[PDB]
Design a protein around this ligand. Structure first.
Ligand SMILES: [Cl-]
Ligand SMILES: [Cl-]
Length: 261
């Protein structure tokens, strides 16, 4: 893989959509399914009551997810799976708004965007995925350890490095939640890390407000893709929905964007 000099990382989503019209029919296949299969083997051992307490979800949703683990099999097709960038729904994906992407937009995203995933490890935008719930921070015991950080080890970082240029200045734009970015090993990552941070106002102070911040990470992802950005300095132009760059508040690889109420 050639890789590129700019890679965006975002979180996955809990809500999945396999019924809306496909915005593109082009797809690829996830590259870490041998690992995924091992996790499915463990996940299948859980009863629905165990899923409900472990994942803190309703009995009904635990049942649905028990069935998903039972039903999962690695021969992915459009009849049984959907591209990750289309399947995921939630605040990040509302900001990203992939349903308005052109085929060229999808090609740029396929080169420059990756979703982290408890089950799949690393997803490309066009990678088909079968439905699941397995959040990265879940304490699922496995052959390699007591949780998914121990399971994935350096694998996720190594896969991201494959998508980065072998030499030259690379940047990884961390637009993922800490739960997911914890699966990446910065000392082993072949890139500078830049973390755009979105702060909203409250009582004269600026703070991370989760529902706003998730949508903002999506808006920024879309900004980068739509404008085909190549360099870190270009990210400071982001101003969607009232955010503005704050240079003085930005250090240590954070790029801070503030927004008034
Ligand atoms: Cl659905
Ligand atoms: Cl997020």
């Amino acid at each position: 893989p050639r890789g590129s000099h700019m890679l965006i990382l975002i979180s996955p989503a809990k809500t999945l959509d396999y019924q809306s019209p496909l915005t593109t029919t082009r797809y690829t296949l996830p590259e870490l399914l041998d690992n995924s299969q091992q996790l499915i083997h463990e996940a299948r051992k859980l009863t629905p009551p165990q899923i409900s307490t472990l994942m803190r979800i309703s009995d009904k949703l635990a049942g649905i997810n028990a069935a998903r683990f039972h039903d999962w099999q690695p021969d992915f097709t459009p009849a049984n799976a959907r591209q990750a960038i289309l399947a995921f729904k939630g605040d990040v994906y509302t900001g990203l708004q992939a349903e308005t992407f052109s085929e060229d937009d999808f090609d740029f995203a396929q080169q420059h965007l990756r979703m982290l995933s408890g089950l799949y490890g690393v997803l490309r935008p066009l990678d088909l995925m079968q439905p699941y719930r397995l959040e990265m921070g879940i304490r699922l015991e496995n052959a390699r350890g007591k949780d998914l950080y121990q399971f994935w080890g350096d694998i996720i970082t190594n896969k991201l490095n494959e998508a980065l240029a072998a030499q030259g200045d690379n940047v990884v734009i961390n637009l993922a939640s800490d739960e997911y970015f914890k699966s990446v090993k910065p000392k082993k990552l072949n890139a500078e890390i830049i973390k755009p941070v979105f702060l909203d106002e409250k009582n004269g102070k600026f703070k991370i407000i989760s529902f706003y911040a998730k949508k903002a990470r999506g808006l920024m992802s879309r900004f980068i893709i739509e404008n085909r950005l190549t360099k870190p300095e270009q990210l400071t132009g982001f101003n969607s929905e009232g955010y503005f760059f704050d240079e003085d508040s930005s250090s240590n690889g954070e790029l801070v964007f503030k927004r008034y109420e």
